[PDB]
């Protein structure tokens, strides 16, 4: 069966929710194993307690932790990260910085890579976070898949919404209060289904 | 006086309107000369008639045409382009491809470069069009100015809006029907005022 | 058979020579049909937007213009609006190669900004994996990036594409074709 | 006086050597105060987010990690939330330099993605203009981009930064300082 890994960091739960929607879309293709994996936290125990994040992260506390070498087991990996000033977050960056051995062994070469994100504002890194993420995936020799415009949600012009042709996204607001909308989750579902379709066509032809 | 040039291509008038708002913001600083300049059209006379664009472009028909060498006269240049698949349009690209002589003479080195855009969808090249534009400005040795988050419009979370920390923007919709909103025009005004402030501080210190 | 189109613009011939190396790499894989097409401002036919729909993969070649594709390529792609709204390139393999005057003036940025456009068309993006040894060459001035093959033209365009640069290009052709073929044979 | 901070992470010393060249370039201009600060995982003090507010310009140095800044730099910048909402870096000059194992594996993309973050902080971005002859060197393998200075470390990190690469770095320091100073003296 086609193995799809969804590897994400989340502080407030936005990326976690999008991840579940991505997973749901992927499972629609059939002959597919979808696995959610979270990246290790870096933030100090205390800062974590004081921020409330410790509480928020607990909502998905039972998700197993990703490791650099487990990535080699997948046919596709869809990475999720909140933006930090238009780049991936340091938690995701440290995790990927750890894939040096995976790199020299060629472990991700020819695998399908895709990305999704979340931001506080409408155009603060909705796109740049994804495209800079793509750079690292290309270093790993992955094939890059985004979200085609055959998904109607990408052209929605009546509600504020994330979702880019580079990859799905969601808006969290300044204070992280806004939860992902149905349009945003529909776009993520499509991404998971689309990535899984492509990975399966590649995987069934070793 | 500090010379600010606003150099743009527009098909349907969206970029033209944003350009006027950028100009208005710039004129707020004082001791500043602001000049609007349009880039030459490439589209065939016939395709132009049949598209209705010939009509739309006429609304700003009296704007003088930019040339590669006139750019050397400015202290800052703020470039406007509609997106084409997350890059600047071919009209703007051909114009900039013409600046080879300007490049070897160093004519734009140390000048303030800024960019604004327009797109059909919320995250189809709102950011990527600007950042890829920045690359060409860096080749010309320009100092890059975007839109700081001290402009409240960048964090607007109640209306669909363009405007990025990389540069102002507007949404035109799938059929180009949506006109620039007040929030979008306010952000452009701020960009013009902010670019002009910086250029003036640099220009008054040769 | 898998259909590969190599769509390019070339002034000095650097891009054309790279294209020939890409095509030879692609034609190594077997049951692969490669067509070279040039974009309009010599016996290479001109590309049209409609013909692109017939490919399983398109490998685009452009010299840089200040870190973007050239206006000739930009104008060509600006004519693919019809293809876009019909979904004509969705799921097809996209790949890019370039040429530049200087060692780091747009070797990378020209390709990555090109990728943006291929993503708008719903394409699947392929670069050059580091299993190609030429990417880590540290003994001779060389183009070639993980994002796609490249060549160095020099200030006056006198510099010929090197053997290292062409072999990277050959690899990109073979690798892109191998990917396209696996997709093409699994409709 | 104009205050320049050079904030960097260095493993092998390549980035540190580049920083020393940037600082020497900056200190050429006169009435310029340059401080080197390193980001946390040696007698260079550690950077903090609050000290950055005291600079007129910040020049950031990072080795690449697959075409992005390294996690140590990323984590440091992720702690600048307070600075951000207070507007503490708005209008300050920002500039970047890097180091990579291979000739086109993130020489450019590492810098341009760093620029994104500096733009979120409202900074004014400065690269390296082509009036610096080293940028067009075509005789020796060399780093140095119009986006910012760079050095090549090699696969094992054995390669020393060359004289061409350091002179480009020196230029970037001088050029950034010259810009910062003109702004600093025109409040």
From Swiss-Prot, chains A, B:
Record pathway: Xenobiotic degradation; 4-nitrophenol degradation
Note on how the cofactor is bound: Binds 1 FMN per monomer.
Null mutant phenotype: Cells lacking this gene are not completely unable to grow on PNP.
Ligand binding (NADP(+)): 12
Domain Flavodoxin-like positions: 4-195
Gene Ontology biological process: 4-nitrophenol catabolic process; generation of precursor metabolites and energy
InterPro entries attached to this UniProt entry: Flavodoxin/NO_synth, Flavoprotein-like_sf, Flavoprotein_WrbA-like, FMN_Rdtase-like_dom, NQO
UniProt catalytic activity: 1,4-benzoquinone + NADPH + H(+) = hydroquinone + NADP(+)
Entry keyword set: Flavoprotein, FMN, NADP, Oxidoreductase
GO molecular function: flavin adenine dinucleotide binding; FMN binding; NAD binding; NAD(P)H dehydrogenase (quinone) activity; NADP binding; p-benzoquinone reductase (NADPH) activity
Protein EC: 1.6.5.6
Coiled coil (residue ranges): none
A GO-annotated cellular component: membrane
Binding site for FMN: 10-15, 83-85, 118-124, 139
Entry superkingdom: Bacteria
Cofactor: FMN
Pfam families: FMN_red
SUPFAM superfamilies, A to Z: Flavoproteins
Family per record: Belongs to the WrbA family.
HAMAP family: NQOR (MF_01017)
Quaternary state and interactors: Homodimer.
Record function comment: Involved in the degradation of para-nitrophenol (PNP). Catalyzes the reduction of p-benzoquinone to hydroquinone.
UniProt name for this protein: p-benzoquinone reductase
Source organism: Pseudomonas sp. (strain WBC-3)
């Amino acid at each position: 069966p086609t193995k799809i890994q969804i590897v994400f960091y989340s502080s407030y739960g936005h990326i976690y929710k999008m991840a579940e929607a991505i997973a749901a879309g992927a499972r629609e293709v059939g002959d597919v194993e979808v696995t959610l994996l979270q990246v290790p936290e870096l933030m100090p125990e205390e800062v974590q307690v004081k921020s409330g994040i410790k509480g928020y992260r607990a909502a998905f506390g039972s998700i197993p932790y990703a490791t650099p070498e487990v990535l080699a087991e997948a046919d596709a990996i869809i990475f999720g990260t909140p933006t930090r000033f238009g780049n991936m977050c340091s938690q995701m960056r440290n995790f990927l910085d750890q894939t040096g051995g995976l790199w020299m062994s060629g472990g991700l070469i020819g695998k399908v890579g895709s990305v999704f994100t979340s931001t506080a504002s409408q155009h603060g890194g909705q796109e740049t976070t994804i495209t800079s993420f793509h750079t690292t995936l290309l270093h790993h020799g992955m094939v890059i898949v985004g979200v085609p415009y055959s998904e109607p949600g990408l052209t929605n012009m009546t509600e504020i919404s994330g979702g880019t042709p580079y990859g799905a996204s969601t808006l969290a607001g300044a204070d992280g209060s806004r939860q992902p909308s149905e349009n945003e989750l529909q776009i993520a579902r499509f991404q998971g289904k689309h990535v899984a379709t492509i990975a399966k066509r590649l995987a069934n032809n070793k």
